[PDB]
Amino acid sequence: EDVQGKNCLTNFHGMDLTRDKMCSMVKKWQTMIEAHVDVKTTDGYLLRLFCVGFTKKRNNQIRKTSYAQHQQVRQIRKKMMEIMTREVQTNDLKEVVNKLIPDSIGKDIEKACQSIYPLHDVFVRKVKMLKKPKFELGKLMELHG
């Protein structure tokens, strides 16, 4: 966003996952649940968060498929949408980026979905920055210590 001299300053712009990890996560005999939410933070940083989830097999399960009902999938997607939209509008980007360093949102979604169908991993596989507010210098120089 700005360079002072012989030293350039940056800002958060997005986050992605390794393509190999995403390829290895999508396997057979499990249902993938997708959800994109267009939710803005306290300031005008609009993000389109995506989500990926899978079902697995219990330790005593014999059924190889382990699928889910369509209504259960819809309920899970609604839960994920609500969880992500709840933890965005209440806080600024500066520390929700820190929140994004661990899978705290993913862990919250995983814990919230134990009642519908037990999912194992919740990942925000992509975050885009759709709109940004008017360029500011004070926030930038506060960001870099």
């Binding site: 097999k57 330790n59 005593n60 399960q61 014999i62 059924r63 190889k64």
Partner: protein, 65 residues
């Protein structure tokens, strides 16, 4: 080959029997289901038999799919 001597040493081993019965053991491990089955044929309790705890855990038939 149809041998009639049948490996003399192993034939003797076949002839050898132990002094113990190897079956008339003093302790019998049986589930309550077998005890209930026995209780309703002709006889009831025994003095050389005891019920064991129910071995039903989760299930048999390990996951194959």
């Amino acid at each position: 080959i149809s041998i009639k001597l049948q490996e003399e040493e192993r034939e003797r081993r076949d002839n050898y029997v132990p002094e113990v019965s190897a079956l008339d053991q003093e302790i019998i491990e049986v589930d309550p289901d077998t005890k209930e089955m026995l209780k309703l044929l002709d006889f009831g309790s025994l003095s050389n038999l005891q019920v064991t705890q129910p071995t039903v855990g989760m299930n048999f038939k390990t996951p194959r799919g």
